[PDB]
Amino acid sequence: DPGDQICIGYHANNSTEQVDTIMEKNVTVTHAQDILEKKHNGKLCDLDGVKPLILRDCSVAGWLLGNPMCDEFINVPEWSYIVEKANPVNDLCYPGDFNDYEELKHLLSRINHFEKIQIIPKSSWSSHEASLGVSSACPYQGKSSFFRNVVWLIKKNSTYPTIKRSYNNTNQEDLLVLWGIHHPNDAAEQTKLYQNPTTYISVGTSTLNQRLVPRIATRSKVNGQSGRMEFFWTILKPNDAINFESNGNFIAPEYAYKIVKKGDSTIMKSELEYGNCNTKCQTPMGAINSSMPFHNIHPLTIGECPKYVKSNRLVLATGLRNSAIAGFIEGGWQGMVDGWYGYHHSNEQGSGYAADKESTQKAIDGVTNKVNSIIDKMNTQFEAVGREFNNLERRIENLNKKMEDGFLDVWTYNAELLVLMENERTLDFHDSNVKNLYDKVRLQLRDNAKELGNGCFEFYHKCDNECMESVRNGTYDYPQYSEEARLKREE
Amino acid sequence: DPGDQICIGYHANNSTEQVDTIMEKNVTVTHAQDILEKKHNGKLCDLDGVKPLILRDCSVAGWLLGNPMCDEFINVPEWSYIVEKANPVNDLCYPGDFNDYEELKHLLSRINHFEKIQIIPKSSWSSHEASLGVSSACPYQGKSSFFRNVVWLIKKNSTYPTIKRSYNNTNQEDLLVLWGIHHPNDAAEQTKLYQNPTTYISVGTSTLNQRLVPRIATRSKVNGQSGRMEFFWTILKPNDAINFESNGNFIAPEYAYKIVKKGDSTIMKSELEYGNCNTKCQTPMGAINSSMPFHNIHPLTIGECPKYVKSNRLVLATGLRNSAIAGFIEGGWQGMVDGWYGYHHSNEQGSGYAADKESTQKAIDGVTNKVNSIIDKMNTQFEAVGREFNNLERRIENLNKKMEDGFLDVWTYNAELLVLMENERTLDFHDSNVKNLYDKVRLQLRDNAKELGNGCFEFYHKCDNECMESVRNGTYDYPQYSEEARLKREE
Amino acid sequence: DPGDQICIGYHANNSTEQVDTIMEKNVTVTHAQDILEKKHNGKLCDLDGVKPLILRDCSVAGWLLGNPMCDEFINVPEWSYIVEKANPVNDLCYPGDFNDYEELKHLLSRINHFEKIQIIPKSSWSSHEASLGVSSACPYQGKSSFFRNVVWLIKKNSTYPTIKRSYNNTNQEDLLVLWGIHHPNDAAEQTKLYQNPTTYISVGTSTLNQRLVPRIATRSKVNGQSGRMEFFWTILKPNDAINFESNGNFIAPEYAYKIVKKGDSTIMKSELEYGNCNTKCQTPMGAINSSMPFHNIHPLTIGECPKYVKSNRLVLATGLRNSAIAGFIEGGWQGMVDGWYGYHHSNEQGSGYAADKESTQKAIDGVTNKVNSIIDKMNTQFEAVGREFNNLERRIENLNKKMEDGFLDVWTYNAELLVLMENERTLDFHDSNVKNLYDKVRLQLRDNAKELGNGCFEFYHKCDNECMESVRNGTYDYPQYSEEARLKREE
C-alpha cells in the first residue's frame, strides 16, 4: 500500500523523421541518417589539385591548329580534364576533317606538361609562298586569314619545287606534330595554286610511313568554300626525326607541342564557371565532397565518385520506433531524456528515470558500426565517364550504354533493398534489446517481486536506492531479502 | 474439474508448396509466390505499339538494293526492330561487299518514317546504256537481271562520256543514298564494258569527299561471277546536294529512302511468326508480359525486360511453416480455417477457434510489402541486345560477352541469395509473432491462470465468452477476478 | 539441502579465431571458415587438359613469319592460350607493320589443330631470285638472312616478269596464309631490286579483293634499315583458291598453316615456368584449384575462376561467440567437450554434462547449409581477360577498364556486406537456440522446480538420471511428481 516498483522502458522524442523497411512503409523513428549525396557546388573545379582546360567557344581541333577566331586562355601547361560546349561555335574555319580526332581528344584529356614550340619557321620558306595561304572562311581582324600553327604553302613565281624537311626531336619529351593536305575543287584550282597537276605528301618517322594524294570531288559550299582541308598527327618519340616531302597541296607544320602523359581522363560537356575549388569528383552540373557511397546528381562524372543511383532518398534508421508510470508494453518515455533503454523506479527515497548505460552503449556502438560498414566497405577507384564515340561508332556507344545502364540498375536495386533489409534488422534489434532488459530483471527478482503485466515489477520488500542500483548493476542479492519477501507474499 | 482454457496457435493447411532458406532445404510452407518469369507466347509482336520489320529470306543489304529474288512485304513505313534469319538465302546476288554494313543495319534497326523515292530516273540516261547492266547471277522471271534500286550503266555505241549528276534534297527529311563500283576481272572486260581503261567515281556532299578506283584481282567464281560489286552510302541532310562524277564502273542510284530516326534498337535472329500481339519485351523465342523482376527465357531481348538469370525457380515464402486441444508447441491447427495466428478456448458456453485479427493483419501487410518491394524497387530501362559485330571485330564481341556474362553472374547470384535470406527472415518472423502472442496472454493473466507447458493456460476462475474476448482484445481486467482466482489457487 | 539441479549452457573452447559482423568488430568465435582463395602454385599449367603456347622471347608475328632469331619449341599442334613476355626481344627483324595484328593474335589465342605446310616451294621460282632476299637486320648464323616462312623475291638477270600463282586448298581444314609488300627508300632502290619502277600486288579469294601499291617516304633507320615490310593474312576456306599477281615488291608465301578453331581465349603476359599441372583457372602469377567463390590474386585470369575482389579476408562465423555450476547467463562451458547447446545436471547418481543432440544437429546442418549456399549458388562461366587493344584503341581499352573496375567494385562490396550480415545472423541464431532450450525446459518443469536466475532450475522432487533424460527428451511427466513437488513447495 503501495509497494516499491521498477519498470523497463525506452527513449522517445518529438522526431517526425520517417524510414521504410522491407515490411512497413513510413515508420516514424527517433533518429535517421541519409547515405545518398544530393548536393553539388554548381561550379567546375581543380581535380586532385590540377586545373581543368576550359574551351569557352573552341573545339580541341580549333584550339590545336589555331583557328584565328578562338579567343581562349593561352598559357596553361597542365590539366586534369577538358571542358567543351556541346556544339562549339568555332571548329574548322576552313571545312574538312581531322584524322583519328576522337583518339587524339582522349590522348589530350589529361596532360602533365604542354609547351608549344616552333619546329619550322614561317621565314625558312625561300622557294615557296608562306603568306598567301589565306581564306575569307578564316577571318581575323576583318581581313582574310588562316589557322596560325600551320602554313598553307602556295607556288612562287609560277613554280612549286619539291619540299624536303627533316626535324630531329632534340627535346627530352614526346612531340605532338600536326600537318594537313588541301583537296581542291578542280584541276584549274590545282595548278593555279601549286602549278604541278599531280602531287603527293610523304611523311616518315621510325613508326609512320604515309603517302597522301589530293582528291577532287564536286562538293557543297561550307563557310563559302567547296575545298576541304584534311589534318593528320603523330607523336615523335624523343630521339626520332620526322621527314616531309611534297609536290603540292601541303599544309606544313610551323608550331608543334611538347607533351608528357601520365594516365588519361575524358572530355566533359558543361556550361559552368570555373570556381577556384578543389575536389575528388566533378559532374557536368557541379563538384561533390564525396563521403557518402551513393549519389543521384549526374552519370557523366570524373574522379573518385560515389556510385550513381536512380533514387531520391536512401535513409537508414539509427534510433528507435518513436511512440504509477507504466513500462515498455504501453510505449516510449519522453522522460528518458538520456539513454536508449532503461528504468523508472519509485521507493520511499522518491521516483525517477535511469538509463541502462551498458546496453545503451552496446547498441549505439552497433548502429554506428552498421552505418560506418555500409559507407567504408565501398571500393572507390578513379574513373572518367564521357561520350567519346562518333556517328559511325554507334554500335560501340550502344555497348557503352548497356554497361552504364547495367551498373545503374544493379547499384540502384542493391542500395534500395540494402536500406530496407537493414532498417528492419535495426528496429528488431531495439525490440530484442528492450525484451532482454526486462528478462535481465525478471531473472534477478524471481519471487521477491510480482510481474504487473505492463513492463513493471512490484517488490515484496523495501527496495531503497541502493537495492535498485544492484538490480540495474545485475548484482541484486536475492537471499538477503527472500525472508522479508516470503512474509508479505504469504498473505 | 476441468477448468476453463485458452490456447495460442497458428494456421495449417494441406499445401505441399516447398521453399528453400539459407539454412534449410525443401521446407513445406502454407503459401508461396514465384518471382521468376518462365512463360513466353511463342510469337514476334509489336513493341510499345509499333510493328517489327520481318525479312523472311532477305538480308538488309538485299532488301535495300532490291535483290530481285527478295519476295518481301513491300509497304511498311515505320518499325521498332528488325528480324533476319541466321543465314538468309538471298543476300548480294552479284558477289561483293557493303561498306560500313553493320553500322547501317544498326542505324536502320528502328525507324520513325521510311519512304522510297526516285532521285535519278532510269530514263534520264541519254548518253549511256541503262538496260544492259544485267547478270545471270541476279535472275528475275528466269531471265538475267539486277538489283532494282540501282543502275549498272554500260557504254553506248563505243563511248562512256564523263557523268555529272547533282541531286538537291528538297524534302523535309534526311535521305539515305546508295551507290556502287564494279571491280572487273581484267583490262579486256574493263574496256568491253566502259571503253575507258582508267576510271574513277567521285562523290561529294557538305560531309562526303570520296574518290573510288576499280581494283583488278584474279578471284574465285561466286554465283558464277569473278567480278565484285562494292556498295557505299551516306545520309544527305535536308538542304544539301550530292554530286556524282564517273568515267566508268559506276552503279548509279535510281531510288533513295527518306528516313526519320528517333533512337535505336537492334537486329533479332528468329524463325517465328508475327502474331498481332503488343508487348514491352520481345525474345527470339517469344514475347513476355513482364510484371516479374527476373526471367530465364533468352538473353538476346529488346524492350523493358526482367533481368536475365541462370535459374529454374525463385520461390518466396509468403505463408507459415506447414505442420483438450494443445497449442503451438505441438504444431499447427487445420481448424484455424481463417487467420494466421490466434486462439482456441473452452468454457461453459462451449469451445472453438478465433483469429487474432490485429497481429494477422500486421503480418499479411508485412509479407505483401516484402514481395512488392523485391518486385517494385527493380529499375527497368529500354535496352536492345543483339550480335552486331563482324568476324574482324572478335575482340569487341569478346568485350560484349564478358559484360553480358558478368551481369548474368551478378543478377543470378544476388536473386538466389536474396530469396534464401528473406525466406529465412519470413519463417523467423512467424515464430516471433506466435511467441509474442503467447507472451501477450501470459502477461495479462499472471497468476489468475496456470501455464500448462503446451501453449495453453488453465484459468483459476470462470471465464465466459466476454472475459475470453477481453483477453484477445488485450483488455483483461485482472483485479476483477484476483479474489476468485486466489481462493481456487490456495487449495 | 541441496536439491537436484539441471542447467542450460553452450560449447566454449580455446579458439582465438576472430570474425566481423555488421555491428561488432573483432568478435572471438569457436570456429570460422575463409571463403577467399589467396593461394596460387606459382606456375603456368594446362587448361582443362590442354597445354599453353609459351613464346619465351618471340612475338606472335615473329613466330608466324619465322624471324630466324626465334629459338622456340617448334612442334606443338594445339593450345588453350598464349603466353608472351611484356616486350619480347624478337619481333619484326626487318622493320614494318602487321595488318590487323591484334585480331589475328585473338584468332590464334586458342587452336584445336595447327600444322605448317608448304603451299609454294622456294624451288618453283624459275624466272626470279629466291635466295638474294636477305638482310643484316635479320641475322642467322652470323650471316645476313630473313623470315623463313615467306620469300623476298628479287629480279633475275635484269628482269622481274609478272608473277601469277594460284593455290587451291585441297585440305579438309581452313588455311591461314601470310604475305607482304616491301616499301623501299627511293626510286633507285625500287629499280635496283625489282627493275620495274611502278609495281603492285593483287590478291583474290572468294572473299578477298586486294591491290597493294608500295609507298616511298624518307624514314628513320630501325635495325639499320629505312625500308619497311608490311604483312597481310586471310583464311582460305577449305574448297577455295587464292590468286597472287605481282610486278615487284612481293614477299611471297612459302609455308602456310592448317588451323581448326573451336572458340577463343586470349594472350597472357607472364614470366613463369610451365609446370606439368592441369587447372580450370590460370593467373599471370600462378594457377588456382577454385572451390571458393572469391579470390584476390590477379584480375587477368583465363578459365572458370572465382570472382576477383579487393579484399584480404572474407571470414564467416560457423561456431559460437567464444567465452553448483552456473548456466548460460554467466558464459560458456569448456566441459561441454561435445555438442553446441546442452545441459549440466546434479542428482544423487552424481553430476555431469550432456549435449542436446536434436537442437545441436539442427544448428550444425543450418550453418553447413549457409556456407554451402554462399559457395554453390555462384554461377561460374569460362572467360579470358587480357589487354588486346593497341595505342589507337585507347577509348575501347577505357571502355574495358570501366567494366572490369565496375565488376570489381560490385563483387568486393557485396562479398564484404554479405559476410558482415550473415555473421550477425549466425551469432543471433546461437543466442536464439540457447534461449529456446531454456524455455523448452521451463515449460516442461513449471512449478515442480524453481528458476535460480543463472540458467539453472532447482527441483522440488528427487530427479534421478531417468527423470533427467525425460527432460532432455521433452517427455517429462509433470503429473507423476506434482504431489511430491507440492509438499516441499508448501514449506
Ligand SMILES: *[C@@H]1O[C@H](CO)[C@@H](O)[C@H](O)[C@H]1NC(C)=O
Ligand atoms: C508516406 O508519406 C508521404 C507524405 O510525406 C505520402 O505522400 C505517402 O503517400 C505516404 N504513404 C505511402 C504508403 O507511401
Ligand SMILES: *[C@@H]1O[C@H](CO)[C@@H](O)[C@H](O)[C@H]1NC(C)=O
Ligand atoms: C621566275 O623567277 C624569275 C623572274 O622574276 C626568273 O629568273 C625565273 O626563271 C622565273 N621562271 C619562269 C620559268 O618564268
Ligand SMILES: *[C@@H]1O[C@H](CO)[C@@H](O)[C@H](O)[C@H]1NC(C)=O
Ligand atoms: C539546294 O537547294 C536549296 C533551295 O533551292 C538551296 O538553298 C541550297 O543552296 C541548295 N543546296 C546546295 C548545296 O546547292
Ligand SMILES: *[C@@H]1O[C@H](CO)[C@@H](O)[C@H](O)[C@H]1NC(C)=O
Ligand atoms: C552495483 O551496485 C551496487 C549497489 O549500489 C554497488 O554496491 C556496487 O558497487 C555495484 N557493483 C558493480 C559491480 O558495479
Ligand SMILES: *[C@@H]1O[C@H](CO)[C@@H](O)[C@H](O)[C@H]1NC(C)=O
Ligand atoms: C528436394 O525435393 C526434390 C523432390 O521434388 C528432390 O529431388 C531433392 O533431392 C530434395 N532434396 C534436396 C536436398 O535437394
Ligand SMILES: *[C@@H]1O[C@H](CO)[C@@H](O)[C@H](O)[C@H]1NC(C)=O
Ligand atoms: C557512235 O554513234 C554514231 C553511229 O551510230 C556516230 O555518229 C558516232 O560518231 C559513233 N562514234 C564512233 C566513233 O564510232
Ligand SMILES: *[C@@H]1O[C@H](CO)[C@@H](O)[C@H](O)[C@H]1NC(C)=O
Ligand atoms: C579447287 O579444287 C576443287 C577440287 O578440284 C574444285 O572443285 C574447286 O572449284 C577449286 N576451286 C576453285 C575456286 O577453283
Ligand SMILES: *[C@@H]1O[C@H](CO)[C@@H](O)[C@H](O)[C@H]1NC(C)=O
Ligand atoms: C474488447 O473486449 C471487451 C469484452 O468483450 C469489450 O467489452 C470491449 O468493447 C473490447 N474493447 C476494445 C477496446 O475493443
Ligand SMILES: *[C@@H]1O[C@H](CO)[C@@H](O)[C@H](O)[C@H]1NC(C)=O
Ligand atoms: C582488431 O584486431 C587487430 C589485431 O589482430 C588490430 O590491428 C585492430 O586494430 C583490432 N581492432 C579494430 C577496431 O580493427
Ligand SMILES: *[C@@H]1O[C@H](CO)[C@@H](O)[C@H](O)[C@H]1NC(C)=O
Ligand atoms: C638476261 O639473260 C641472258 C643473258 O645471260 C639473255 O639471253 C637475256 O636476253 C638477258 N636479257 C637482257 C635484256 O640483257
Ligand SMILES: *[C@@H]1O[C@H](CO)[C@@H](O)[C@H](O)[C@H]1NC(C)=O
Ligand atoms: C637525331 O639526333 C640525334 C642526336 O644528334 C641522333 O643520335 C639521332 O640519330 C637523330 N635521329 C635520327 C633518326 O636521325
Ligand SMILES: *[C@@H]1O[C@H](CO)[C@@H](O)[C@H](O)[C@H]1NC(C)=O
Ligand atoms: C526419453 O527418455 C525417457 C526416460 O529416459 C525414455 O524412457 C524414453 O524412451 C525416451 N523417449 C523418447 C521418445 O525418446
